[PDB]
A paper describes a structure:
In adenoviruses, primary host cell recognition is generally performed by the head domains of their homo-trimeric fibre proteins. Cell recognition and attachment are usually initiated by the fibre protein, via its C-terminal head domain. Like other adenovirus fibres, it is predicted to consist of three domains: an N-terminal penton-base binding domain, a shaft domain and a C-terminal fibre head domain. BAdV-4 contains a single fibre gene, encoding a protein of 535 amino acids in length with low sequence identity to known adenovirus fibres (15–19 %).
Here, we report the expression, purification, crystallization and structure solution of the fibre head domain of BAdV-4 at 1.2 Å (0.12 nm) resolution. It is the second atadenovirus fibre head structure that has been solved, after that of the SnAdV-1 fibre head domain; and the first of an atadenovirus which infects mammalian cells. Crystals appeared after three days and grew to their maximal size in about three weeks. They were found to belong to space group P1, with one protein trimer in the unit cell, leading to a solvent content of 44 % and a Matthews coefficient of 2.2. The final refined model contains residues 420–534 from each of the three protein chains in the trimer, plus ordered solvent atoms. The structure of the BAdV-4 fibre head domain is composed of three monomers, associated into a compact trimer. Each monomer consists of a beta-sandwich of two beta-sheets (ABCJ- and GHID-sheets), in the same topology as other adenovirus fibre heads (the topology of the HAdV-5 fibre head is shown as an example in Fig. 3d). The loop between strands D and G is longer than the others and contains an alpha helix (residues 471–476), instead of the E- and F-strands that many mastadenovirus fibre head domains have in this loop. The CD- and IJ-loops run parallel to each other and contain negatively charged residues, forming electronegative patches on the protein surface. The BAdV-4 fibre head shares only 15 % sequence identity with the other atadenovirus fibre head (from SnAdV-1) for which a structure is known. No salt bridges are formed upon trimeric assembly for the BAdV-4 fibre head, while in the SnAdV-1 fibre head a strong bidentate salt bridge between Arg304 and Glu333 of neighbouring monomers is present, which may explain why the SnAdV-1 fibre head is more stable than the BAdV-4 fibre head.
Numbering used by the authors:
A (entry chain C), B (entry chain A), C (entry chain B): 420 to 534
Write the structure that this text describes.
């Protein structure tokens, strides 16, 4: 099993990611997760340069796909699709619509299995 | 702790399940997870015959309940309830509504505690 | 390191929480999770007194924020924000809207990275 982390300063906020590769007879499992974070603007994309560790989970053609939420002051919940892709050393995290500023986003986990 | 995996071919696509039993003198935790997958038709149910490992987590009368999402072409997010039950050796994964073909479904995890 | 579990009787139902601290030189994590549960009334807040172990994950000013769902009888899915905070030894789990009685709530996990 291989694992690592990456804490990213994006604009004026922090997002904290972890990755794992879990090998077995049947499959390799590629895990990407992210702690809760508070964006400071109407972010649609978070991007950064990855090192070799995090790069190593982007083995499939398909991006990772997860979901997350924010709770509005009126208590309605917004759900966002989260698509995480790599081009060269740049990782991009794309949200299905722009996030609300200054509201916490829930932690999320993506998982890809390669047979 | 005990754990395992099962890859399921269903129709013309794959889903990959992991399971864990985490015993303690406080509780047993039964974990079922699934990697992201891409259904190729508007399925409502994925079923298959369980292996010994996977059958071992179905100790309680209640089915496992989790949720997942798909991001539609217009960027709206559909959330699905996922109910996972066993009758004899047959495991059924029931989605609350039919999945959209050819769109990735997010990974999910379910957890039951027995005290 | 540090981890533990707490089974809480709240009114006439049970919720089962797990906590973990993952020290790190890079991404120091505090995790709170909860197994699926079935509330018996239209609860908005679950609260209880914590012991030192569970208290020990509430180091940040920011509450934990997660999400969970219920599959309603028409097979639509309602998503709830889950905000978990500590005041003195009382832990409060606040749902964004009152839960529907007698319907399973999905398991959830919250993750905070310190720094």
């Amino acid at each position: 099993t291989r694992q690592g982390s990456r804490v990213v300063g994006f604009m004026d906020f922090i997002i904290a990611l972890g990755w794992q590769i879990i090998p077995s007879n049947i499959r390799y499992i590629y895990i990407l997760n992210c702690s809760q974070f508070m964006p400071t603007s109407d972010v649609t994309t978070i991007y950064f340069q990855a090192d070799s560790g995090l790069e190593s989970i982007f083995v499939m053609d398909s991006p990772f796909y997860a979901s997350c939420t924010q709770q509005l002051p009126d208590k309605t919940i917004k759900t966002y699709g989260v698509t995480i892709s790599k081009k060269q050393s740049i990782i991009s995290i794309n949200f299905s619509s722009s996030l609300e500023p200054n509201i916490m986003v829930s932690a999320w986990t993506a998982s890809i299995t390669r047979t």
